[PDB]
Amino acid sequence: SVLLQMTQRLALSDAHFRRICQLIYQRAGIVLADHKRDMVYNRLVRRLRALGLDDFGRYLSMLEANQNSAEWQAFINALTTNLTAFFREAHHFPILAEHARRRHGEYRVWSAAASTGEEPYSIAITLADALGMAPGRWKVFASDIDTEVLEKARSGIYRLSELKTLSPQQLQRYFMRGTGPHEGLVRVRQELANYVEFSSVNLLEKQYNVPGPFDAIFCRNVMIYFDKTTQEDILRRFVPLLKPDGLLFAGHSENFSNLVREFSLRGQTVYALS
Ligand SMILES: Nc1ncnc2c1ncn2[C@@H]1O[C@H](CSCC[C@H](N)C(=O)O)[C@@H](O)[C@H]1O
Numbered sequence: 001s002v003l004l005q006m007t008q009r010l011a012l013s014d015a016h017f018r019r020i021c022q023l024i025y026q027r028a029g030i031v032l033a034d035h036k037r038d039m040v041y042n043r044l045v046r047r048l049r050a051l052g053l054d055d056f057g058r059y060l061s062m063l064e065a066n067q068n069s070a071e072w073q074a075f076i077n078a079l080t081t082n083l084t085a086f087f088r089e090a091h092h093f094p095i096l097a098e099h100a101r102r103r104h105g106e107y108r109v110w111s112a113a114a115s116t117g118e119e120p121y122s123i124a125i126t127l128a129d130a131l132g133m134a135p136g137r138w139k140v141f142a143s144d145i146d147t148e149v150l151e152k153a154r155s156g157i158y159r160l161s162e163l164k165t166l167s168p169q170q171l172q173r174y175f176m177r178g179t180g181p182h183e184g185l186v187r188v189r190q191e192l193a194n195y196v197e198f199s200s201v202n203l204l205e206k207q208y209n210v211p212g213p214f215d216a217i218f219c220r221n222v223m224i225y226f227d228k229t230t231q232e233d234i235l236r237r238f239v240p241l242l243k244p245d246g247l248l249f250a251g252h253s254e255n256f257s258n259l260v261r262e263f264s265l266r267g268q269t270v271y272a273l274s
Pocket residue numbers: 027028029030080081082083084085088112113114115116119143144145146149201202203204219220221222225251
């Protein structure tokens with residue numbers, strides 16, 4: 001009753017790995033480590049198979065040849081790191097609500113690395129609680145370079161355990177719980193989902209197609225995958241996108257001020273135009 005399986009087993013050479021690293025760096029600015037190679041292999045072989053290739057050299061050539069193919073997106077999605085959580089670095093939220101309470105008119109926020117949507121929905125919940133759900137008062141724009149995580153973000157479905165940081169009131173007001181097969185699952189209510197717009201934006205663009213200026217820009221835990229030149233380039237692009245007294249929120253381990261002096265620290269990893 002034994003019938004050994006065996007599906008296609010290809011080989012990622014040192015040379016090919018180095019090539020993958022250069023390509024993603026030039027494209028998305030992401031700097032990969034040598035300890036991610038087994039991971040890179042497991043996620044990329046699936047592309048080789050789907051396309052019917054059995055050579056990493058041939059795959060990389062189709063990519064290098066055609067700089068605009070849809071395959072470039074599958075390549076990117078395979079190598080990004082999307083770890084996130086609802087209300088991560090929670091100290092930022094009371095600060096945002098504080099800022100919003102002042103700046104009247106339309107309060108606009110840009111979440112520059114949305115991942116699967118946890119950060120933008122955290123922002124929306126904070127604003128809905130602070131300002132109330134009323135059309136015209138505030139809006140959240142969210143983007144990411146990865147289209148797989150953006151599609152999940154757009155669906156707004158999460159497992160109830162991922163929401164341990166919400167109060168029973170936020171849960172009731174902003175989500176619908178599931179029953180039967182898809183239970184233990186909740187979905188963001190359409191009412192709250194209408195206040196956030198999702199779009200794919202690669203931070204390495206020399207020009208962003210975003211509805212700025214913004215009162216606040218969240219750029220948390222992404223700069224960590226880029227190098228300093230790349231980081232400085234992006235930060236300088238955020239400058240014209242910030243309204244006069246706007247806020248730039250960075251990730252726990254990021255220090256922006258040391259990259260561009262036009263930014264100044266104001267709170268727990270929060271910057272303001274100097
Ligand atoms: N060049 C680039 N342009 C835009 N987004 C990028 C990028 N390189 C990586 N990213 C994205 O940055 C995201 C970081 S995950 C961080 C999510 C959230 N800000 C957190 O603090 O919880 C990844 O999902 C990845 O797709």
